Design an enzyme around this catalytic site. Structure first.
Site, PDB file in Angstrom:
ATOM      1  N   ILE A 223       0.698  -1.305   0.038  1.00 63.85           N
ATOM      2  CA  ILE A 223      -0.196  -0.049   0.078  1.00 63.85           C
ATOM      3  C   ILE A 223       0.868   1.227   0.061  1.00 63.85           C
ATOM      4  O   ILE A 223       1.521   1.406   0.912  1.00 63.85           O
ATOM      5  CB  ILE A 223      -1.014  -0.009   1.430  1.00 63.85           C
ATOM      6  CG1 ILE A 223      -1.803  -1.322   1.307  1.00 63.85           C
ATOM      7  CG2 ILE A 223      -1.771   1.199   1.338  1.00 63.85           C
ATOM      8  CD1 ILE A 223      -2.588  -1.773   0.149  1.00 63.85           C
ATOM      9  N   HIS A 224       0.827   2.036  -1.115  1.00 61.22           N
ATOM     10  CA  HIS A 224       1.609   3.163  -1.218  1.00 61.22           C
ATOM     11  C   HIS A 224       1.001   4.446  -1.577  1.00 61.22           C
ATOM     12  O   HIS A 224      -0.160   4.454  -0.968  1.00 61.22           O
ATOM     13  CB  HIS A 224       2.960   2.831  -2.086  1.00 61.22           C
ATOM     14  CG  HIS A 224       2.431   2.201  -3.586  1.00 61.22           C
ATOM     15  ND1 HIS A 224       2.345   2.992  -4.673  1.00 61.22           N
ATOM     16  CD2 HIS A 224       2.160   0.994  -3.735  1.00 61.22           C
ATOM     17  CE1 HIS A 224       1.867   2.000  -5.500  1.00 61.22           C
ATOM     18  NE2 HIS A 224       1.639   0.942  -5.040  1.00 61.22           N
ATOM     19  N   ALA A 225       1.114   5.175  -2.475  1.00 67.15           N
ATOM     20  CA  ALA A 225       0.411   6.274  -3.039  1.00 67.15           C
ATOM     21  C   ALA A 225      -0.758   5.881  -4.029  1.00 67.15           C
ATOM     22  O   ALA A 225      -1.779   6.460  -4.218  1.00 67.15           O
ATOM     23  CB  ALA A 225       1.360   7.384  -3.746  1.00 67.15           C
TER      24      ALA A 225
ATOM     25  N   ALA B 119      -3.328   4.618  -1.606  1.00 72.28           N
ATOM     26  CA  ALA B 119      -3.377   5.849  -0.722  1.00 72.28           C
ATOM     27  C   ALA B 119      -4.324   6.799  -1.219  1.00 72.28           C
ATOM     28  O   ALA B 119      -4.686   7.624  -0.575  1.00 72.28           O
ATOM     29  CB  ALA B 119      -2.023   6.140  -0.277  1.00 72.28           C
TER      30      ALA B 119
END
Length: 87
Positions: free
Chosen positions: A13-15, A18
């Site tokens: 889960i990163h950008a 997110a």
């Protein structure tokens, strides 16, 4: 007033996740937070989740507390499987 999802996206889960998750939670005035690694953070935070260090094959717990807290948690469930991010 909460739920549990199984992160299966091969990447973590990163950008990308997110940004789509912060938008859906923003649609509801309820307080949507993300719990991971025994730590409490904000679902509308891009750097907050990065500090957690979530990766593929992980388990998280969402929580909502407000007026439309019910429409927020279930609205994130369909948004996840809809884009193949969690389940």
């Amino acid at each position: 007033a909460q739920k549990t999802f199984k992160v299966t996206a091969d990447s973590g889960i990163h950008a990308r996740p997110a940004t789509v998750l912060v938008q859906t939670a923003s649609k509801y005035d309820a307080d949507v937070n993300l719990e991971y690694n025994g730590k409490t953070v904000n679902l509308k935070s891009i750097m907050g989740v990065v500090s957690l260090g979530i990766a593929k094959g992980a388990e998280i717990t969402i929580s909502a507390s407000g007026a439309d807290e019910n429409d927020a948690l279930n609205a994130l469930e369909e948004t996840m499987k809809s884009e193949g991010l969690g389940e």
